[PDB]
């Protein structure tokens, strides 16, 4: 007979251990707190109760592995603007990108 | 027994500040809004 009204639950069943946290290869696409980026190892010193780390503006660029110690700093996936260089469809139809 | 003692009133100086959250930060100057012990306030020095 389950109990769920009062001070937060004790019993529950999260997953665990997807894999080998997946330092580089912009794959390590979550950690504890949901993140989506290139996620690998770092060299920070998280004050061993502190777990994740913001930058100057509230974006978490560091996290510690839960099951291990592993201060992993995260970095966003990649992006930019594909700009297309063309001689002009009157001259030719080849483009550099 | 009743081993009791005295009182006082002291100026709680620049201290009483705790990491308000479990978030790491580096070389930032955060601007929180938590519940702190306001600087240079009065503490009641119980003996």
């Amino acid at each position: 007979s389950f109990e769920l009204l009062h001070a937060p639950a004790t019993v529950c069943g999260p997953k665990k251990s997807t894999n080998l946290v997946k330092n580089k290869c912009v794959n390590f696409n979550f950690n504890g707190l949901t993140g989506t980026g290139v996620l690998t190892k770092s060299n920070k010193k998280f004050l061993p109760f502190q777990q994740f780390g913001r930058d100057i503006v509230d974006t978490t660029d560091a996290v510690r592995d839960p099951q291990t110690l592993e201060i992993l700093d995260i970095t966003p996936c990649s992006f930019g603007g594909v700009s297309v260089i063309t001689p002009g469809t009157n001259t030719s139809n080849q483009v550099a990108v | 027994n009743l081993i009791t003692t005295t009182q006082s009133y002291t100026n709680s100086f620049t201290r009483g500040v705790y990491y308000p959250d479990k978030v790491f930060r580096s070389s930032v100057l955060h601007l929180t809004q938590d519940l702190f012990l306001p600087f240079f306030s009065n503490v009641t020095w119980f003996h």
């Binding site: 009062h6 109760f49 | 002291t10 009483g16 500040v17 705790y18 990491y19 503490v43 009641t44 119980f46």
Partner: peptide, 28 residues
């Protein structure tokens, strides 16, 4: 200057209003 790193949460939905020591003692 010294900061006070957390020790524990103890999720306790209880309503406190008083306290006191037993066996210094600057309540702020």
């Amino acid at each position: 200057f010294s900061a006070l790193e957390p020790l524990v949460d103890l999720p306790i939905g209880i309503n406190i209003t008083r306290f006191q020591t037993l066996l210094d003692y600057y309540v702020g």
